[PDB]
Amino acid sequence: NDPAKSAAPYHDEFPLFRSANMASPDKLSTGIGFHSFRIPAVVRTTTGRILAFAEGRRHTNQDFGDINLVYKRTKTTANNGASPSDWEPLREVVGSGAGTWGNPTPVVDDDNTIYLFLSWNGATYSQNGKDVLPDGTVTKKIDSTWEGRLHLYLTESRDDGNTWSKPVDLTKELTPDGWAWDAVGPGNGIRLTTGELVIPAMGRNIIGRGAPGNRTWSVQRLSGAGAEGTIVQTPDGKLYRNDRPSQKGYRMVARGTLEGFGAFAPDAGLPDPACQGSVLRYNSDAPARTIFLNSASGTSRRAMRVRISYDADAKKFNYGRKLEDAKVSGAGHEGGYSSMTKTGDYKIGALVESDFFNDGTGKNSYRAIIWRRFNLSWILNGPNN
Ligand SMILES: CC(=O)N[C@H]1[C@H]([C@H](O)[C@H](O)CO)OC(C(=O)O)=C[C@@H]1O
Ligand code: NA
């Protein structure tokens, strides 16, 4: 029932963000390097250029301390990132000593303005507090003070990702008062058939209305949403939140419109180990498809599975295909956060976290990011369907 299964299967994959332990580790032009890269996000722009974002975690793999927001672009608008030589060297969206810049959540607007929502916190604060920094300082716990809370920032590019504006703090506008912890995405926002932008965040969606690249933002509060959410517009044109659960088990899904959402409920078809996932609107003509990617396991992040739903409301996803069927060598053990885009040559492009595990669950375990391309035929020709 899917003509794509008859096309020749295609896959290729290679490390795109190379951690400090690897040959040719990724460093900025300034010489600044990174122990680990985590928290991927990818979008294809209106030109066809692909922009890949990540957190550059300077000294360890930990969520706190000196973390910068880094990126790579495809060298041209037409190369579709097919091989390592198609990608530019590492660049920086925003960096700094005193800050923790993370949670890249991009969305491409009609005018090709690429918006990138981001989180910021102080480099001396952490989620739990009392964590040890490289210099032996102990962090303070994230709190509701201006200095100590998670901020929500916005930067954009008007030149196809070549340069980025100094990020603007939108916390007072788009984060509820009295909040301490926060998250936006991470992964991506979307543009609706009806023209609005929707960016998933902790307990809310951020809605963009008005002129492309000159949007008015507002907050849609959600009941029972997760901290790390994904959003897609399903074939029926409705909205679909698919969120990381607070405890290991299953993805938490809710459906709605810009007028409001129904309740979140576990999707028993989508096991999840309490980790971020990604979702992608593929096409609208028969057969319409939504793509989903996470670790398909209640316990482990190393069960990465890409799936297709043919449902108008994405009610059920197929078994799909295990990413390990096309394993990458020399970049650690694949599994974790992910982000997906369509490419100009009819593939799906996916960024996927990978972990060398050289320090076990400890702070010195190097983390890299894999770039995969595969077509629908590759997914559909999986042996476990
Ligand atoms: C530090 C931060 O801003 N987000 C972190 C997030 C958070 O701790 C919470 O558990 C999610 O809801 O979890 C993870 C994780 O790999 O599990 C990575 C993120 O960097
Ligand atoms: Na930083």
From Swiss-Prot:
UniProt EC number: 3.2.1.18
Molecular function per GO: exo-alpha-sialidase activity
Catalyzed reactions: Hydrolysis of alpha-(2->3)-, alpha-(2->6)-, alpha-(2->8)- glycosidic linkages of terminal sialic acid residues in oligosaccharides, glycoproteins, glycolipids, colominic acid and synthetic substrates
Pfam families listed in its UniProt record: BNR_2
Induction trigger: Expression is increased during conidial swelling and germination in presence of human serum.
Family assignment from sequence similarity: Belongs to the glycosyl hydrolase 33 family.
Role this protein plays: Sialidase is able to release sialic acid from a wide variety of natural substrates including bovine salivary mucin, colominic acid, bovine fetuin, a serum glycoprotein containing both alpha-2-6 and alpha-2-3-linkages in a ratio of about 3:2, and glycoproteins and glycolipids from thermally denatured human lung epithelial cells. Does not show any trans-sialidase activity since it is able to remove terminal sialic acid residues but is unable to catalyze their transfer to the acceptor substrate.
Record's protein name: Exo-alpha-sialidase
Origin species: Aspergillus fumigatus (strain ATCC MYA-4609 / CBS 101355 / FGSC A1100 / Af293)
